Every structure is written in structure tokens, then in C-alpha cells.
Structure 1
Amino acid sequence: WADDFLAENADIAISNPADYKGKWNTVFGNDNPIHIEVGTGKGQFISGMAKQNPDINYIGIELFKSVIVTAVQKVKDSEAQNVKLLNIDADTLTDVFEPGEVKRVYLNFSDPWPKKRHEKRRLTYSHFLKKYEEVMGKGGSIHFKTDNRGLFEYSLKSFSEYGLLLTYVSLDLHNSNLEGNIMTEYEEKFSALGQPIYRAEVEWRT
């Protein structure tokens, strides 16, 4: 079963992440920056980023146990030693990291939750911006990609209301020559479609 697979690969899929709060450098065995992805899905993005940037430590967060099993297999097939995976939600980030332990949050094709009464479930809503702040501290950035126009418009306004600085914005990423862009599985199936991929980098003011 999926639960046996994750128990057997517990060196990648860390079962006790709260035990490493403030000590994640001892987990990776170096003092390199830790970047996280909230919503790893099947794990092509974080595996690709781990192989591209071996001097960056990566931690994928993925609530959905069914899909994280796949992420563990792609991390294993990658042979990258700089990536762990946590089967937790965004609310638990503050149980796992101290302020400043994370340098960057990746969000890729987050659930848009388009209905007004579901605003608080969007991963760009103010509550999650605060969770990201509590793990990144003074500096820190969010690198955000979505195909959903409603979510990206909402996110630009949410980022702005929170007081973040927009340093990068593309309203058509695949025609914008972002060198070293690592696609998610979902993103790969868009260049043929022709619909724009939206991208933002936003940072805390210092």
C-alpha cells in the first residue's frame, strides 16, 4: 500500500518533521538555503528544481497522500540528495520551521477556490501569507505560477494589500523566455493549448 511505500522511504518522506524545527540544516548536512514548494503534486517541479540547483535544499509539502507517493518515486528516480517531502498542510508549516529557516515559497497551480465564500482556502489569502512570513522572517519571496486568470488577479491584489513588493510579473510565461523554467506535469500540457501561464515573484520589504 501507499503507507508501506512512504514508511520504507522515510529518508525522503520525513514522518516526524516537527522534530527538526530549527535544525533542518542538520537534516540536509549543509547550511544552504531551504526553499519549499506548497502543493508538490506528482513532484516533477521539485525534482527538476533539485537537479537544476544542487546548492539549494528543497522541501515539498503535499497533503494528498496518493500523489505524494508519486513525488517520492520521482525524487528517488532523480537521485537528488537535496530534497525531502512532507505529508502536511500549509497550516502545519509553523510547527516544522523557525522564522528565517525557509528562504522561499513556491506555489504552482494552487486550487483557485473561485467562490467568494472560499477566499480563505486560497494559498495566496492573507492567512497563508502570514504563515509564509512566520517561516521566512524578514526576507523571503513567493514564486507563483498559475493558468487561472481569476486566481492570479486575486493574488496580485492579496499580495499588494499585504504590502509585498512585486519584482517579477509575466502575463504569458511561455512567450517570456524565463531561462531554467521547470514545468509542473500540468504546465507541460499548455504550450500546445496556447493559454497564457501567469507568473509572479513577490518579496517582503526590508
Structure 2
Amino acid sequence: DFLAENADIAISNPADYKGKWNTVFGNDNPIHIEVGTGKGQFISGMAKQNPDINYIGIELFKSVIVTAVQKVKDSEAQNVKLLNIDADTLTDVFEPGEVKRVYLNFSDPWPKKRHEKRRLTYSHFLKKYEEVMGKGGSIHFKTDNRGLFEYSLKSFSEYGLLLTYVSLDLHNSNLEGNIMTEYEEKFSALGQPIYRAEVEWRT
């Protein structure tokens, strides 16, 4: 396997490092995660922009995480690890408070009511994010899907989160230094709007 020869980037045993992720990276830098990494343009780009932040990207499909490891093998970035796990197993990999941020980019919308439970912004997953971040983290979410974003804002509110940032047209707003995904850098810059939100826990 191609994943075995690059086992320094793609970790096959993440559960063994629960509470000890600072020993893997070798520093106490904040750990920011991404659920649904895909081909990895986002995670690799964020890695090069922020060398002093540790990134861990999770992806369900083996066939696509292969391209993500290649992008981290291209750019010398030593601050990115990739895991082939489900979002439900994040609590088996991280201790409460070990993660400082969760990134959700163009997550699967699942518009049908029966599949509300599958949306990465539904209460079940918001609970999993809390269980790995404690009360000191944040969720940075961006999508071009109107329905999912509308649902997400209501879901964040119902759960009791604080909306600290919201952009209803990201491209003609402040491009602080946001890295685009493969899908984002592919479709329109002056067409369909991209929505963005930053939510955190109240203290």
C-alpha cells in the first residue's frame, strides 16, 4: 500500500495517541482539525500559511486520502497528519480540550429530512466536537449550499453556540487569507455566493 510507505503522514493507529498528540508533532502548538478533507488542497494550503499550527485532516475514503497525502508529500509541511476515520471516532482519538478548532468545508448537505442526522452540523456532531474541544474551541464552516447553511445557523443556535463571524458572500468580503478547496477554486468568483460562519461556546 502507498499509505504504508507514507505512514509518517497517514497515521493508521490514531487511537493510540489520544491525549498524547503533542508527542507526535513534537510541540504544544494548537491542534486544528478538518472533517472531510477530500483531496487535501485546503489542509495543505492552511499548513503552509500557518506553520505554527498543527493540522489533522480526517477522511472516510481511502481512495481520496491518497491524493491528500501526496499534497503533503509535495510541500515539505511537517505540521499535517491525515487519518482514515469517521467523525464518530474523533472521541477515540482526542481527549477533551486537545483540539482547538474544527473546519467544515462544503460538507455533504443531505437535504432529505430522514438524513438530517448525517449533516456534520447536526447536534450529534456538535456534541462530538465539544467532547474533543471542551468549551475553548470554535467551528469554522463554509459552503455554497444555501439550504445547509440555513440549517447550520439554526442548528448552531439551537445548540447554544455564539456566532462571532458570518459572511453571506465570502468572495467580495475580506479575504483575510482563506485557502480555497478544489471545488472552490474551480467554480465562479463572481457567480454563486459562498457562505461562511465562525461559532464558539459561551463562557
Cα distance in 1, alignment partners of residues 175 and 61 from structure 2: 29
45, 50, 53: which is aligned to 1:53? 50
Distance apart, 1:138 and its partner CA: 1.6
CA distance in 1, matches of 2:190, 2:71: 25
Q: C-alpha displacement at 1:78, in angstroms?
A: 1.4
Q: Structure 1 residue 179: deviation in Å?
A: 1.4
Q: Secondary structure in 2 aligned to 1:48?
A: helix
The alpha-carbon deviation at position 94 of structure 1 amounts to 0.2
* Other structure's SS at 1:58 match: strand
CA distance in 1, matches of 2:107, 2:81: 20
Partner of 1:192: helix, strand, or coil? coil
Write the distance in 2 (CA, Å) between the matches of 1:170 and 1:189: 20
User: Offset at 1:178?
Assistant: 2.2
CA contact (8 A) 2:57 2:83 kept: yes
On the 8 A contact 2:171/2:189 being kept in 1, the answer is no
Q: Secondary structure at the match of 1:135?
A: helix
What are the residue-to-residue correspondences of 1:56-95 with 2, within 5 Å?
Answer: 56-95=53-92
Distance 2:95 2:2 in 1: 29
Q: CA deviation at 1:193?
A: 6.1
C-alpha separation in 1, matches of 2:189 and 2:31:
33
CA deviation vs aligned residue, 1:44-96 (integer Å, no higher than 9, x gap): 00000000000000000000111100000001111100000000010000000
Question: CA offsets, 1:73-124, max 9 Å, x none?
Answer: 0011111000000000100000000000000000000000000110000000
* TM-score, length basis structure 2: 0.99
Taking the aligned partners of 1:190 and 1:73, their CA distance within structure 2 comes to 23
Report the identity percentage: 100
Could you tell me which runs of 5 or more consecutive residues in structure 2 were left unpaired when the two chains were aligned: none
Q: Is the 8 A contact 1:174 1:191 kept in 2?
A: no
Aligned residues: 203
Alignment of 1:99-178 (within 5 A): 99-178=96-175
**Runs of 4+ with deviation above 4 angstroms:** none
What SS class does the counterpart of residue 3 from structure 2 fall into?
helix
